[PDB]
Amino acid sequence: LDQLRQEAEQLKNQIRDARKACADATLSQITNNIDPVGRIQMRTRRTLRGHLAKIYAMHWGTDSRLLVSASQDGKLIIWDSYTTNKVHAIPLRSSWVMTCAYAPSGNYVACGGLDNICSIYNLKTREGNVRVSRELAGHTGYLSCCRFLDDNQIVTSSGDTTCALWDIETGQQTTTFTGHTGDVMSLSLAPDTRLFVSGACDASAKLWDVREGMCRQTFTGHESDINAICFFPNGNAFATGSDDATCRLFDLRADQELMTYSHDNIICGITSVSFSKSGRLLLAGYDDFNCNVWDALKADRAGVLAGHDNRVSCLGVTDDGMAVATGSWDSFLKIWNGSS
Amino acid sequence: LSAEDKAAVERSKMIEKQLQKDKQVYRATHRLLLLGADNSGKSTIVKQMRIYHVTSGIFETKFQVDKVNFHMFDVGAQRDERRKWIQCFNDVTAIIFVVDSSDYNRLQEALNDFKSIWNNRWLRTISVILFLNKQDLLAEKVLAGKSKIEDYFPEFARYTTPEDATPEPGEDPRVTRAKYFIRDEFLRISTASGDGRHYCYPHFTCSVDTENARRIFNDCRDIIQRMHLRQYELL
Amino acid sequence: IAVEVFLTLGVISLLENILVIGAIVKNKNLHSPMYFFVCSLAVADMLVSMSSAWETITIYLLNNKHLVIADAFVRHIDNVFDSMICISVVASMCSLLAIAVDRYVTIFYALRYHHIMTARRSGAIIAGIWAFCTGCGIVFILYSESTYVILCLISMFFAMLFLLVSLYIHMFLLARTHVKRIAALPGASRTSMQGAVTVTMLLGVFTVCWAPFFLHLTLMLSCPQNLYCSRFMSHFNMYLILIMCNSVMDPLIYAFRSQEMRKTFKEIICC
Amino acid sequence: AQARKLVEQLKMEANIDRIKVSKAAADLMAYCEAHAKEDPLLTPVPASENPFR
Amino acid sequence: SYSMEHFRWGKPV
Ligand SMILES: [Ca+2]
């Protein structure tokens, strides 16, 4: 018993020293010439209403126009942010849904939650409604976030300290990504689609080679549950936002924290993150009923988005860069675009 | 406009009609979260409450009382930590917290869990219907004379039956003193911190008792009445 | 009474009630049926205030020698005015009892409430109130010279005061049961004083601001030429002033008591 | 067993070849400059070419 | 003439 803890600590000391060694120049000081963005004020162009209850997840489309929204009332709505229309409204089986995803080809959407089940719905059928194409069982905890790689593979994070890669047609976990002590809260897939990062309630984030099923890195620095995570426009960084009211930006080769988005007034936690297209605009939902807009390279506030009567639980930026949607517990989605 | 955009608006209007239909059913049904531990009889409460009918991680039981519909959500096949998925229940009517009141070992653990529920945000409004389940085991335990409660709680030697006691007929003074002591140990945490926005409603239940749906119905009426009165600056 | 004292209250009520209408239209936590009746009340109060303010201006001019039109058009203006005033008075009272009935149903029919009232039924009841009030106002002002109209107005006030008192004493008497049950709780580290203060600040404002005018009417009918009753009737202006004080003070006691509306107040004022 | 699992999954962390933050922060701060003019939020767009008006 | 006066129902009828 003592030997195992001693060996773990011995590895930890070496890896900490190695991490500290490769810190020659801080990211903060190599950006002095970087012009601050200033102030970003964005207004509510569209307000999508129709949801009964709290919105717990939204996900855009690869066309940057359609979007899926998952609410606690059991509704999964596909909107058209341009015309404020609705295109489908799926009634779910389990009303406690905590994630949604929108397949890149547009033919599918996925949703899951405390039913421990990732349900895949086939949209492009149009026989009168949308039917559950296939449910994917095998998880023990609750289902925090699922993201498609293609139409026949989906990566799923659960509250059982695990993530898993599925094969939709077969329905069996091809591979299982284990190594977490606490339960996993958010996963973000990569632009190259070869890896992905997952962040958990123990203050930890990890990469996973989906084709090998083994963790490759593990990062520390937070003090509580990690809530949201996302890749920077390239798969060479990921912003992780946790429940200690602070954000951080973990690079991959550095294997070390770089920036700490904190503010003394800020005491409320963090729920969602979503980068912009340029890797210059880090959008984070906080529990204090409003979202915030940080600068990745500056770690200085740049904007606020108040407008929600309750907690901002959702956040997603288009693949084009046009718009930013925020969902919240007051049953409205807001499409924010900057003013010319 | 065009023809395609007109058909888009037709589809949107049809969906909005369906959503209006669903609004009334959603706002007119009351959602309850059944929390408890392994030794507590939750499953028996749920099974015996599937009489009032109209690795899965959650079980939804529907039941109506007096034409009022209720969802009840028993969280099963989940891990130990409940600090993250309980935030999803900030808009339920009530949380039914079941406590096994005859174990005497994990009653301290039950109190700590109830304290954490009571003090957590996203639950600062949600009232708790507290079911002190398995009272007949408790009775058979104090009367028989083994594992006396004061060995686990040293405050029992300085406690007496409160004035508002309404004992069941044919009940020993000792069992009623201990039963109200446990109720008082929970109500102490309930009243200690939270404001007038949520209250704890203790009921001495049992695993097989039949009047449980009525108790949830009555206390939900109380919860709603008090909420509305507190926003009318009455009460 | 000076026209200044009577126009000041009109402007103050206009401001408060426009603010309330905005705070309800520009917030979605406040789209319940209750706040629709609060907005109806705000509109009715706004009309009482502005219609009476403009009469006062026109009377201030005609009786003086600044603006003189013949007898038929003076009469025709006068009527239109009184008309609007009557419609808005009846609408104001009906929108107070709408809030009372809504609160009563939310409390005493707590678990069935959304099978009783939706947002659409609110609009139906509001539209019905205002059509009925328009009809009553026009009939009451074209037929004013009869006893029959004045008895109708009096009966409406007494019927709508009895019901408001009865609707709020019951609520307070239930709140006392709940406060007694909280008090019995152990370790109670709870005030019927709060309920008493609210019951008073609702009923007493209603009564003080609406009862003198209807006593004026019920003594115009009963005892028109007796010293006590004549001395009472001779204060018509001091009773209209109270009617407008009701418009000033209703937003304080209904809209300003909501935490969500007090948040919307800060959001609106910071714009 | 779990302790051995943590030990091995942490020793597989040791062999990873890092890179100094001087050029491990060339991924950031040198990616934006390649995408500075195509990001509508960071640099606002004229309202004609904006489906969100 | 017709002297106008505050609202209606004032002087005894
Ligand atoms: Ca007149």
Author numbering:
A (entry chain B): 4 to 343
B (entry chain A): 12 to 65, 204 to 253, 264 to 394
C (entry chain R): 38 to 226, 231 to 312
D (entry chain G): 10 to 62
E (entry chain L): 1 to 13
What do the authors report?
Superimposition of the TMDs of α-MSH-bound MC5R, MC1R27 and MC4R26 showed that the α-MSH molecules were well-overlapped especially the middle region (H6‒F7‒R8‒W9) and recognized by MCR-conserved residues in the lower half of the TMD pocket. Meanwhile, several MC5R-specific movements were observed. The α-MSH binding was stabilized by a series of polar and nonpolar interactions involving all TMs and ECLs of MC5R. These observations were in line with the mutagenesis studies, where I1223.32A mutation in MC5R completely abolished α-MSH-induced cAMP response, while D1153.25A, D1193.29A and F2546.54A greatly impaired the α-MSH potency (> 100-fold). The C-terminus of α-MSH was mainly clasped by ECL3, TM6 and TM7 of MC5R with an interface area of 317 Å2, significantly smaller than that between the C-terminus of γ-MSH and MC3R (409 Å2). For single-point mutation, E922.60A and D1193.29A in MC5R completely abolished or greatly reduced (by 447-fold) α-MSH-induced cAMP accumulation, whereas D1153.25A increased the basal activity but decreased the α-MSH potency by 269-fold.
Members of the melanocortin receptor (MCR) family that recognize different melanocortin peptides mediate a broad spectrum of cellular processes including energy homeostasis, inflammation and skin pigmentation through five MCR subtypes (MC1R–MC5R). All the three bound peptides in this study adopt a “U-shape” conformation with the middle region (X–X–R–W motif) being the deepest segment within the receptor core. Here, Ca2+ and its coordinating residues were clear enough in the cryo-EM maps for structural modeling, thereby demonstrating that Ca2+ resides centrally in a pocket formed by TM2, TM3 and the peptidic agonists in the three structures.
